[PDB]
């Protein structure tokens, strides 16, 4: 690099005077209450880099934060520690084609849990976060968020999410991905967010949705989730991909596997074992075409064909193949979770239909409910609902006391789970 900075005054001068290709190098020590507004004028071919002289030796404390506010900017080697915020996000991608790497955020917590803020928020396009580490977030708001508008093709890979203390508070996901598909849209668009080759260890947070997809065309690929409460969840949206992940529950209370609402998903080559709950949950969708009883309270949304959206998208047309669910404390595959056979305020009665659920390996602690399919209520007002059959076969259920230890069932593309040595920051803690 080529611009040395020792204090906040010098840093803002360097940000304003750096030209494309420059590097801004921060001196080691503690940087208290520095709001970094990184808006240097870089180029696609010559990015501008803000980084520590020595990775990990620069500690941003107090109310410190970082905002990427112009394209082609790189930030490397920072540590956020001994500090907190009152709102917003510790790190924010407000532009396009920026990169954060080799950065850690460590117990960067406020005093009240109710003082909410993200740790990383995406609000722009084609951004990259990799080899970063996150430990100890204990307040409201997802650790990583993706914003609803103009924030597509962001990628988070080779990061490390560790010891996110458990409190059952919805809104403490590790990842929450908004974007097109939030309102259950089925067009070509989406968030196109990639969560890839990350390691999660005791990343409890809310202990419900570790990853919460609420948009379309996202990729959850090759992550390792160790002993973490909650599951990987497609909550809203369509055409999401959940592939080649490893969920080692280590019998953590509250852990479970994969859960989906919506259509067109590809859930392939996942290895789930020793979770407390279900391996795979296909949740029942909500009927919205008309009110089945006088009690229906629709979720309103302007701009839709009916003026409303379902609480949960019908699970149809998906691919649920070549997964392994071993030693699970709940059902192996739950076809039709959260069924309401007595429609009232909600009409969550659409059983999954036309999905391919084949070539899976399953064992359960109870030795029952390897595959559990909800059967329709006999309620007369649901009598004429007929669901396209799922394609079910070539699933192999093992004796849980005698586990496995060509088109074979179970994970056909076998990779290796991630060690903490290959993810997160290269420097220590």
C-alpha–C-alpha distance, residues 169 and 142, integer Å: 11
- Among 29, 5, 32, residue whose Cα is nearest residue 17: 5
Please report, for residues 161, 314, 428, the alpha-carbon distance to residue 136 in angstroms, rounded to integers and kept in the order given.
9, 36, 15
Name the resolution in angstroms. 1.9
Q: Which residues are CB-contacts of 386 (< 8 A; sequence separation ≥ 6)?
A: none
Q: Which residues are CB-contacts of 249 (< 8 A; sequence separation ≥ 6)?
A: 227, 228, 255, 256, 272, 273, 274, 275, 276
| Nearest-10 Cα torsion for 139, 144, 147, 150 | 160
- Among 104, 39, 96, 108, residue whose Cα is nearest residue 71: 96
∠ Cα 397 402 404 (to 5°): 65
Q: Which residues are CB-contacts of 226 (< 8 A; sequence separation ≥ 6)?
A: 199, 200, 201, 202, 248, 250
**Contact (CB, 8 A) for 227 and 239:** no
Phi-psi region of 70 (alpha: psi -120 to 50; beta: other; left: phi over 0): beta
**Contact (CB, 8 A) for 222 and 195:** no
C-alpha–C-alpha distance, residues 200 and 222, integer Å: 12
**Contact (CB, 8 A) for 17 and 43:** no
C-alpha–C-alpha distance, residues 211 and 177, integer Å: 8
| Nearest-10 Cα torsion for 360, 365, 367, 370 | -30
* CATH class of the domain comprising 3-397: mainly beta
Residue with tokens 């009927």: 287
The number of helices, as runs of H, and strands, as runs of E, in the chain is: 1, 41
Technique employed here was X-ray
């Amino acid at each position: 690099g080529n611009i040395q900075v020792k204090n906040a005054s010098e840093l803002n001068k360097a940000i304003g005077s750096a030209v494309a290709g420059d590097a801004i190098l921060m001196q080691p020590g503690e940087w208290k209450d520095v709001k970094i507004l990184f808006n240097s004028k870089a180029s696609k071919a010559k990015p501008i880099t803000l980084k520590a002289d020595q990775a990990g030796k620069v500690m941003l404390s107090g109310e410190s934060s970082l905002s990427f506010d112009a394209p082609y900017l790189v930030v490397e080697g920072l540590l956020f520690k001994d500090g907190s915020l009152k709102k917003g996000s510790v790190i924010q991608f407000n532009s396009d084609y920026c990169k954060l790497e080799n950065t850690a955020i460590v117990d960067f917590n406020p005093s009240q849990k109710s003082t909410g803020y993200y740790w990383v928020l995406f609000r722009g396009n084609n951004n990259l976060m990799q080899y970063c580490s996150f430990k100890g977030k204990n307040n409201m708001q997802p650790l990583v968020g993706n914003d609803q508008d103009n924030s597509r093709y962001n990628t988070v890979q080779y990061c490390y999410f560790k010891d996110i203390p458990y409190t059952p508070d919805n809104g403490r996901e590790i990842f929450r991905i908004w974007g097109y598909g939030r309102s259950e849209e089925t067009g070509d668009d989406g968030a196109f967010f990639t969560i890839k080759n990350n390691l999660f260890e005791r990343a409890h947070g809310e202990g419900m949705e570790i990853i919460s997809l609420k948009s379309n065309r996202n990729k959850v690929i090759g992550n390792t989730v160790i002993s973490t409460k909650g599951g990987i969840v497609g909550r809203s949206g369509n055409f999401n991909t959940i592939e080649e992940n490893f969920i080692f529950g280590e019998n953590e209370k509250g852990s479970y596997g994969i859960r989906l609402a919506g259509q067109g998903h590809h859930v392939v080559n996942n290895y789930v074992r020793d979770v407390d709950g279900d391996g795979l949950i296909l949740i029942c969708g909500e009927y919205i075409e008309k009110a089945l009883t006088d009690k229906y309270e629709p979720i309103l949304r302007a701009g839709t064909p009916l003026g409303r959206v379902p609480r949960y998208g019908h699970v149809k047309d998906g691919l649920y193949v070549n997964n392994t669910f071993l030693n699970v404390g709940g059902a192996g595959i739950n076809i039709g979770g959260s069924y309401n056979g007595n429609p009232g305020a909600d009409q969550r009665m659409l059983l999954p239909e036309n999905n391919t659920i084949t070539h899976n390996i399953i064992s359960t602690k109870s030795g029952k409910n390897a595959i559990q399919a909800t059967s329709p209520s006999q309620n007369p007002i649901l009598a004429n609902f007929k669901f396209k059959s799922n394609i079910l076969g070539s699933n192999l259920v093992y004796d849980n006391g005698a586990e496995p230890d060509t088109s074979k069932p179970g994970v056909r593309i076998k990779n290796k789970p991630l060690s903490s040595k290959e993810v997160g920051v290269k420097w220590s803690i």
